[PDB]
């Protein structure tokens, strides 16, 4: 069953931006309803935990700028696994998240902190979301080769040979 | 970065050869056939080298992660960013291999091994045929 690749997949939510608008405060809230947000990530678990509790270079800059991002670490350091964190922000139109997974290897002999490993690239441009360059290059080259093949077969069709002259047109 | 640098220089020379063959085809008068053959063969073998070198360094290209510059403004250059970002094939090639697969259409595996044995048999047969007659 034909599936559109998620790298080119682009979601638009006019109702959400009309109701709430685009801001770093609710950029994760905007991302929550997208298909790219896995329901198995610990961010959703933290979300239900918060809901239950209520019912009952630029990395350091964005680190020190917002306190909710602080709360994100102090709620995310306890849970290791696939997590969604912000990468960088330039207002009022550009935001990009950092898709990384954490394995808090607390074993004896490792003086390093929890291991952070990239998984995917996500770019929020306007109200749209974008998600390999190797594929782009090979696709461009192969389409170029197809066009070249068509041109060369047409040119060879145009070619006419005679023994007494050689090849002419 | 070294692998992508080599890819850069080789693709740049390939694009230069493409520009060449372009501005010698754009003339209203067609040059001699032989010059066209030389240009075709050179550019096409250069494309082969491009393919081979891109094959060699897939790991370095895959390991790299794309990220826009902090200094690069997206508000004014979002069109330029989207131009390079898009990667979907041209449609005509798409329905091209769709019709190709339509025409082509444990059983598949044993046909695959039957193709293996036909290939090996044909190779051995032509080796024998070449050995039959002295070509030196």
């Amino acid at each position: 069953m034909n599936v559109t690749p998620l790298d080119e997949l682009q979601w638009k939510s006019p109702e959400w931006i009309q109701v709430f608008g685009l801001r770093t405060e609710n950029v994760l809230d905007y991302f929550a309803e997208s298909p790219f947000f896995d329901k198995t990530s610990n961010n959703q678990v933290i979300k239900m935990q918060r809901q239950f509790s209520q019912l009952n270079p630029a990395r350091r800059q964005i680190l020190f700028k917002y306190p909710m991002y602080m709360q994100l670490e102090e709620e995310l350091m306890k849970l290791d696994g696939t997590e969604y964190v912000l990468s960088s922000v330039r207002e009022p139109d550009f935001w990009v998240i950092r898709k990384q997974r954490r394995t808090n290897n607390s074993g004896v002999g490792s003086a390093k902190g929890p291991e952070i490993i990239p998984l995917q690239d996500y770019y929020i441009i306007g109200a749209n979301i974008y998600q390999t360059i190797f594929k782009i290059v090979q696709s461009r080259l192969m389409s170029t080769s197809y066009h070249l093949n068509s041109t060369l077969e047409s040119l060879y069709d145009l070619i006419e040979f005679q023994p007494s002259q050689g090849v002419h047109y | 970065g070294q692998a992508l640098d080599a890819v850069r220089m080789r693709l740049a020379q390939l694009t230069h050869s493409l520009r060449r063959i372009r501005d010698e085809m754009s003339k209203a008068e067609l040059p001699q056939w032989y010059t066209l053959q030389s240009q075709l063969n050179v550019t096409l073998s250069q494309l082969v080298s491009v393919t081979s070198t891109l094959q060699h360094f897939q790991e370095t290209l895959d390991s790299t992660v794309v990220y826009p510059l902090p200094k690069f403004p997206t508000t004014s250059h979002e069109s330029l960013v989207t131009t390079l970002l898009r990667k979907k094939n041209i449609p005509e090639v798409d329905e091209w291999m769709k019709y190709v697969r339509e025409t082509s259409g444990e059983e598949i595996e044993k046909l695959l091994q039957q193709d293996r044995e036909i290939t090996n048999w044909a190779r051995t047969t032509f080796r024998n045929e070449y050995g039959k007659h002295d070509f030196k």
């Binding site: 997949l9 682009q10 979601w11 | -």
Partner: peptide
Amino acid sequence: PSYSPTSPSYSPTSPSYSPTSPSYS
């Protein structure tokens, strides 16, 4: 040095083929 740089071969007129489909909520 550099014998000649490459001519700008930008094609902004290219319409692109981005598939758009997950718009409905």
